[model samples]
Target: GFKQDIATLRGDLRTYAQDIFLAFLNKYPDEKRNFKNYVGKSDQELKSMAKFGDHTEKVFNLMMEVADRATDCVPLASDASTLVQMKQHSGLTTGNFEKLFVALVEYMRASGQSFDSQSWDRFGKNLVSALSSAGMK
Candidate 1:
């Protein structure tokens, strides 16, 4: 049921990616600086940066991928790579990773979407298991 709902919302979800990132960065501009290319860039400048858009798309797409596999919630190999990059380049701790997903979910709610929290609880547990295994905590 949750997967079916996600399938129905997939297209709308894509459209929210940039806005979601925009809201997240606005809240934590410091995290925005984690990417050297974005260092010292103003919000207006960030709006026009192709790299910003690319990063938003990649992150949102990966979230969708995780949702699709959330029944088991085993992270993809790519997820493993991303975890490494976040720690190495972005200095993102496990707590930061949690906040990032919180941003996505909050933005989804603000955009008039909702989901089964029970389903997400399972997903969250799997994600934490994966993150812990990756040495994130």
Candidate 2:
């Protein structure tokens, strides 16, 4: 039910993609420093770059994919395979992903989106399992 609810809400959530990215960066400046593309880039300049939005969209897309698969009772690890590869290569820890997932939940609550408590918990559990399965821990 939670996954289904997320599946239904994802379309509207996409509109907040940029805001979510900014929220994560604001909360975790160290994570931002890990991105070479963002080096020397001001907020204004970052917004000007197409790559910024592309990367933001990529993050949200993976999130949405996890929701979709979880709704179908499918294993979510496969959904994040690419992310695991990339993050591992870049030396980013699973903690970064865990924080990012927390960022999304915090953003949703901070922005007053319509999901309830159980929904957030279930969604979070799925992400955690996905990461675990992918050997991200």
Candidate 3:
């Protein structure tokens, strides 16, 4: 069931991440400079922005690698190297990622019955802990 659940959750996380970024951009227009590459862009252009769609997909995959806490495999590192890059490259502070992270938790809470609470609680905290090690907390 890990396959089914993780695959579905990946899509869900992408959706929420998209919405949250849009909300963040709109609510705090000044922060628009953070994504100046996307300014005055079309849908396809916006999607092409390296900081937006692509980053979310990477985040989803990172979440998968994190949730993949299986005993059979050694599993990778708590795996937050990409998150650190966000700060170094995209100028995303810990606060930005934190807001986005909380939005993910909020989506799980506000979204429907398909999301399991107990799993989310574990994933959410474990994710934060991992980020902490990567110097993003």
Which one wins on TM-score?
A: 2
User: For residues 1-137, could you state the per-residue lDDT of candidate 3 as single tens digits?
Assistant: 44455667666666655655665565555666666666776555665666777776665666566566632222233455555655544565555544554555565566664655445544555555555666664
Predicted candidate 2 versus true structure: per-residue lDDT over 1-137, tens digit per residue: 55655664566554457777777777888887577678676666877788787777776776676666765444356665766777434576567766776876687677655655456655666666776677776
lDDT of 2: 0.66
Model number with the top lDDT: 2
Give the poorly placed runs of model 1, Cα more than 4 Å off.
Answer: 12-14, 39-45, 72-82, 85-90, 115-125
Residues forming the 10-long window of minimal summed lDDT in candidate 2? 71-80
- For model 2, what is the error of residue 36's alpha carbon versus the real structure, in angstroms, after optimal superposition? 2.6
Q: By how many angstroms RMSD does model 1 differ from the true structure?
A: 3.7
C-alpha lDDT of residue 110 in model 2: 72
RMSD to native for every prediction? 3.7, 3.2, 5.2
> In model 2, which runs have C-alpha deviations exceeding 4 angstroms?
1-9, 12-14, 40-44, 71-75, 86-90
**Relative to the unseen true structure, what is the C-alpha lDDT of residue 33 in candidate 3, on a scale of 0 to 100?**
66
